[model samples]
Target: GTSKLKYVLQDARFFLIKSNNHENVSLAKAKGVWSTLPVNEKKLNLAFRSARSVILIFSVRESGKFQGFARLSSESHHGGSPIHWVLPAGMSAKMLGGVFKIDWICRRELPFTKSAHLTNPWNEHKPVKIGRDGQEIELECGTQLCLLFPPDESIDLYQVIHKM
Candidate 1:
């Protein structure tokens, strides 16, 4: 059935690294592996405390490179110009999951978008879906979402880690 299915998996190898050190690019450090949801949930709440709507981001963790950044909200525009890069009215972000944690950012930005790259160090890598706050959105690897940082900044892994 896997052949007819949309996704498949292969044996994996991982390495645990110190959270303090973000410059290591070892395959063993790949925290975003495949997984299955073993929980019972009911609902998902996606409304913001202030804004009319919110956006959620699912990111993959890159080792030392900054290859992901989610868009909490669109750059506000005022007087035909632009506004601040604020989190929009009411919004917040958090991490969810066990095997691979996905950053759950909630704000006024719907269809939350984030940039990514290849050579970068790491990404949180998680599939994303919009839901109500109380709604349970089962998540795991192979998920797509926004991340922080760019591949350019990851040129110097050690530099990036030390800077952090």
Candidate 2:
């Protein structure tokens, strides 16, 4: 039960989204319409010390419909980095087809493979550029749309596999 509180406390930072058309236009322009909700003491420490970086994709909206997308980096919030206002190329919030609500909030770290490379050979996937720094990687989704992965056997060999 004690560990649970630690988990709750450490999990305070969150991913938030708002319709780009919301009256809170200032937050959108300055912070790109996305906020981490909070930077708790523990999570703030992690952001301060951890070498890994976090990315947030906030849905942009207009007239109660999906319009576009904006991206933000955790390092940007914590260390004077910058938020990315646009999503990856060809990837627009409108592509969601108005199925999902544009205004919502979620937790830190989306569910996806981490520290891995993705490849887009057939050009079916959106372009993305990845930059590696120490143990962290900067993922720019657009430009180099190649999905790269080491495969099962290769990951077993390297023994450095990470999935998140």
Q: After superposition, how far is residue 21 of candidate 2 from its true place, in Å?
A: 6.1
Instruction: Looking at model 2, report the run of 10 residues with the lowest lDDT sum.
Output: 155-164
Report, for every candidate in turn, its global Cα lDDT versus the true structure: 0.22, 0.27
* TM-score of every candidate relative to the true structure: 0.18, 0.23
Candidate 1 lDDT, 1-164, residue by residue in tens: 22111121111111111121222111212321211122211111112223222222222233322223211122221232121112212322112121221221211122223322212122332223322122222222212221221223322223212221
What candidate 1 gets wrong by more than 4 Å, as runs, is: 1-87, 90-126, 129-154
- Please report the candidate that would top TM-score against the real structure: 2
Candidate 1: C-alpha lDDT:
0.22
